[PDB]
Amino acid sequence: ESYSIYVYKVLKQVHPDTGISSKAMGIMNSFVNDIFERIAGEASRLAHYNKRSTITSREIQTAVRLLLPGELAKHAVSEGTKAVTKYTS
Amino acid sequence: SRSQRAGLQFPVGRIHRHLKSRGRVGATAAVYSAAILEYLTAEVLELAGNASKDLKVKRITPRHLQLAIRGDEELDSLIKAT
Amino acid sequence: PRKTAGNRLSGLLEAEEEDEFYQTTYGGFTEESGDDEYQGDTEDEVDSDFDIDE
């Protein structure tokens, strides 16, 4: 799947005056896709483990906590919860 | 958009479709997923745009991405476990 | 005590040995000759079962 355009929206948010090369953009899209597959596969097995029919932010939080190291898991849990909160609110 | 409601740049509905292609998948799973992916993209990008001695990179190339990821103990270990 | 002590040490150690990981991963993190800038149906696409009762 392609996420290159959303990687660009983030790039313009972090570094408004910074560009990105095509190879570089392809690597970003490959990294986003590789991480997506890990998280998904992980949430998939937790829903399997708990006999759950619906995958929710609970499985994603559990997956993030398992696969993301150190300070990254703590911050990505704060970012995911915050986003779900402002969507559900 | 639904992505704006969650305060994100990442496509929530597209991420929901990708999750389903990998039983039900709820909006929260899609919103939480977009948020974490957006988080990591922003962490990788923040560093690469600052991968200079003057800290000013005009255009991000694969050398900057290698400096960003390899230049970070946690991104390096994340990418390597993957 | 020094908030700046060992400033670059961790990176110099990382740099000591070549990482083949960054040479193969996603096609390798190496600059190409002719590596142009990235250019510019963009919006989100939502299915019927997005907002189902979880």
Swiss-Prot record, chain A:
Positions of post-translational N6-acetyllysine modification: K51
Protein name: Histone H2B type 1-J
Family assignment from sequence similarity: Belongs to the histone H2B family.
Glycyl lysine isopeptide (Lys-Gly) (interchain with G-Cter in ubiquitin), cross-linked positions: K86
N6-malonyllysine: residues bearing it: K82
List of residues that carry N6,N6,N6-trimethyllysine: K51
Residues where PolyADP-ribosyl glutamic acid is found: E1
GO biological process, one term: protein localization to CENP-A containing chromatin
Post-translational modification N6-(beta-hydroxybutyryl)lysine, affected residues: K51, K82, K86
Keywords: Acetylation, ADP-ribosylation, Antibiotic, Antimicrobial, Chromosome, DNA-binding, Glycoprotein, Hydroxylation, Isopeptide bond, Methylation, Nucleosome core, Nucleus, Phosphoprotein, Ubl conjugation
Residues found modified as Phosphothreonine: T81
Residues carrying Omega-N-methylarginine: R52, R58
Residue(s) carrying N6-methyllysine: K12, K74
Post-translational modification: Similarly, monoubiquitination at Lys-86 (H2BK120Ub) by the RNF20/40 complex gives a specific tag for epigenetic transcriptional activation and is also prerequisite for histone H3 'Lys-4' and 'Lys-79' methylation. It also functions cooperatively with the FACT dimer to stimulate elongation by RNA polymerase II. Phosphorylation at Ser-2 (H2BS36ph) by AMPK in response to stress promotes transcription.
Gene Ontology terms, MF aspect: DNA binding; lipopolysaccharide binding; protein heterodimerization activity; structural constituent of chromatin
UniProtKB/Swiss-Prot annotation, chain B:
GO biological process: cellular response to estradiol stimulus; chromatin organization; heterochromatin formation; positive regulation of transcription by RNA polymerase II
Effect of D76N: No effect on interaction with VPS72
Keyword ATP-binding part of the UniProt annotation: no
Annotated GO MF terms: chromatin DNA binding; nucleosomal DNA binding; protein heterodimerization activity; RNA polymerase II cis-regulatory region sequence-specific DNA binding; RNA polymerase II core promoter sequence-specific DNA binding; structural constituent of chromatin
Residues of the full protein shown: 19 to 104 of 128
Key words of the record: Acetylation, Chromosome, DNA-binding, Isopeptide bond, Methylation, Nucleosome core, Nucleus, Ubl conjugation
Protein name according to UniProt: Histone H2A.Z
Residue span of region Required for interaction with INCENP: 71-81
Gene Ontology terms: cellular component: euchromatin; extracellular exosome; heterochromatin; nucleosome; nucleus
Compartments where located: Nucleus; Chromosome
Stretches the record annotates as M6 cassette: 67-78
The organism's place on the tree of life at top rank: Eukaryota
PTM summary: Acetylation by the NuA4 histone acetyltransferase complex is required for hematopoietic stem cell maintenance. Not phosphorylated.
Tagged with keyword Acetylation: yes
Similarity field: Belongs to the histone H2A family.
Biological role: Variant histone H2A which replaces conventional H2A in a subset of nucleosomes. Nucleosomes wrap and compact DNA into chromatin, limiting DNA accessibility to the cellular machineries which require DNA as a template. Histones thereby play a central role in transcription regulation, DNA repair, DNA replication and chromosomal stability. DNA accessibility is regulated via a complex set of post-translational modifications of histones, also called histone code, and nucleosome remodeling. May be involved in the formation of constitutive heterochromatin.
UniProtKB/Swiss-Prot annotation, chain C:
Residue stretches of biased makeup (Acidic residues): 32-54
Domain of life: Eukaryota
Localisation: Nucleus
Subunit structure comment from the entry: Component of the NuA4 histone acetyltransferase complex which contains the catalytic subunit KAT5/TIP60 and the subunits EP400, TRRAP/PAF400, BRD8/SMAP, EPC1, DMAP1/DNMAP1, RUVBL1/TIP49, RUVBL2, ING3, actin, ACTL6A/BAF53A, MORF4L1/MRG15, MORF4L2/MRGX, MRGBP, YEATS4/GAS41 and VPS72/YL1. Component of a NuA4-related complex which contains EP400, TRRAP/PAF400, SRCAP, BRD8/SMAP, EPC1, DMAP1/DNMAP1, RUVBL1/TIP49, RUVBL2, actin, ACTL6A/BAF53A, VPS72 and YEATS4/GAS41. Also part of a multiprotein complex which contains SRCAP and which binds to H2AZ1/H2AZ.
Biological role: Deposition-and-exchange histone chaperone specific for H2AZ1, specifically chaperones H2AZ1 and deposits it into nucleosomes. As component of the SRCAP complex, mediates the ATP-dependent exchange of histone H2AZ1/H2B dimers for nucleosomal H2A/H2B, leading to transcriptional regulation of selected genes by chromatin remodeling.
Assigned protein family: Belongs to the VPS72/YL1 family.
Protein name: Vacuolar protein sorting-associated protein 72 homolog
Location of this fragment in the whole protein: 9 to 65 of 364
